[PDB]
Amino acid sequence: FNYKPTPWTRADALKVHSDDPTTTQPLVDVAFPVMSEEVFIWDTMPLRDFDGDIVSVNGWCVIFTLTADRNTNNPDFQDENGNYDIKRDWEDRHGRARICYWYSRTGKDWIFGGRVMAEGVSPTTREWAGTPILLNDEGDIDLYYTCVTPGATIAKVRGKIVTSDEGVSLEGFQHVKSLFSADGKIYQTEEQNAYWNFRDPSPFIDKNDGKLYMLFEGNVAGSRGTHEITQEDMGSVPPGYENVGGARYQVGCIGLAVAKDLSGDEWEILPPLITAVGVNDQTERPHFVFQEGKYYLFTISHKYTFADNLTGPDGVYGFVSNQLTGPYTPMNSSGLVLGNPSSQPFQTYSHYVMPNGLVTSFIDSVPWEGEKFRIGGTEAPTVKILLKGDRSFVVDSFDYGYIPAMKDIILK
Ligand SMILES: [Zn+2]
Ligand SMILES: [Zn+2]
Ligand SMILES: [Zn+2]
Structure with a gap:
């Protein structure tokens, strides 16, 4: 716990650019197929090993x-x-x-x-x-x-x-082990905020120390509305961008915990890797890609969970470090990796970046006739991105719900 969380600053968020074609999801066709007429799906979680390999x-x-x-x-x-x-x-x-x-x-x-x-x-x-x-x-x-x-x-x-x-x-999923909830000193509790965020575990092993960790979505601890926005949360904002309005109500963070051993039966909560105080209330479904000795830390967020006098599209944001515990810098300078296009701002959500560069998402709401919408509840087309240092590039797209394995495990 001898590291500082990295703030995603207001100054970083002021760089967010919608409809950059290198960081924008292709338009979903409103005539999309649905994978089931019996069920809706949304958040999709591919089977993976402890490094993130699908x-x-x-x-x-x-x-x-x-x-x-x-x-x-x-x-x-x-x-x-x-x-x-x-x-x-x-x-x-x-x-x-x-x-x-x-x-x-x-x-x-x-x-x-x-x-x-x-x-x-x-x-x-x-x-x-x-x-x-x-x-x-x-x-x-x-x-x-x-x-x-x-x-x-x-x-x-x-x-x-x-x-x-x-x-x-699948058989024998019979015994749910409760691991931990928000603590109230590091991560915000229900007592502190009726609308607290605490969800979305993503376990991984770090080969550098051999330990089992997990990411999760949290909020920075404190009573709703009481958080102090610091210079470190502001970053180097330009002249005229000092007014934050209600930004103290946006307190998202990417949390970290470490397991006592590789059984993952007992966990110690650690300081968050990324804080977004004064920037965004929701850093959802955090996940890593480990590539070229770097830690690419992705998180999904909403246009409407940005703080006053900031904005960005729904989509996946990201950060990169040489070290697990940081410091991190934002991908593409702003943090935005893959944003929805402004003409269909709610077309997809839950953009999940896999280590092969494929990004899966579910179809939410696509403009249809005049002021009407068509609802998805089915997989969107898969996008391929390349990671090049602290930048990303959209390079290809594939079929609806294309989520191939990176390797095949032969069962004994
Ligand atoms: Zn693996
Ligand atoms: Zn949204
Ligand atoms: Zn075996």
Whole structure:
């Protein structure tokens, strides 16, 4: 814990540029296909090992998704006229979230596998995002995820993957181990802020010290509205950009914890790697790419969680360091790595950067006819980026939901 968090400053955020074609997701076609007429998916968590390598098992690619039923024929989701209300159904998904798995030989055209956990296994009904880790070539998996309402608790659950020529089955995800919640000295609690953020574990091993760590989304500890914005949060802002309005209400951070040992059964919370006090309230789904001896730290954020007198698009932001604990500098100078285009600002969300440079996201809301929108709840086209020092470049795009493995694990 003998390091300082790196602020993502207001001065950095003032460089954020929407519609830079090197850092903008291609336009989603409003005629996109949907991967299921029975379920919505959104946050997508590819099966990975402790370095971030996407792994297939016996030639089967696997993804875990936040999932909810499409309530097409459910009277509870009809409007006053008795017509299915897709917008109300979709916007209610967070309260219905369950983790499901899908499989494919090809990394696309996903086959639905169903629930990871039987209903009742999760301490909370809501199963919010995290990371599935393939532990070994016997097929053992720890799904790290977030138990939400009551509270917000990082948890994990052990099970097994089994394969055949037909597909993949998950078994034995029966015992959820609660690992930790917000502490109130480093990370903000529900007591301090009814709207606190605490979620989205991403475990990794650092080969430099051999230890097991995890990233998560947090907020900087303190009673809502009381945070002091410091010069270090401001950065070198230009003349006329001193007015921060309500910026003390934006207190996002990328948290870090370290495990007592490689079992990951016991955790010590550490100071955050990145703080965004006075800049953005939500640094969601933090994740690493380890490339060319550097630590590329990515996080997803919203236009509407920026502080007053700052803005940027929905998308993935990022930072790079030579050392796990920093100091970090922002990717592309501003932090923006892949932003939605201004003509379709909500087209996708939950942009997840994999070490092969592929970026997956789910389709949210695309402009349709006049002032109307079409809802996705299905995978967006995969984008390829290159990382070159502290810059990134969009170079290609692929099919809807293309999430191939980087390597294949032969089960013993
Ligand atoms: Zn690996
Ligand atoms: Zn083995
Ligand atoms: Zn947004």
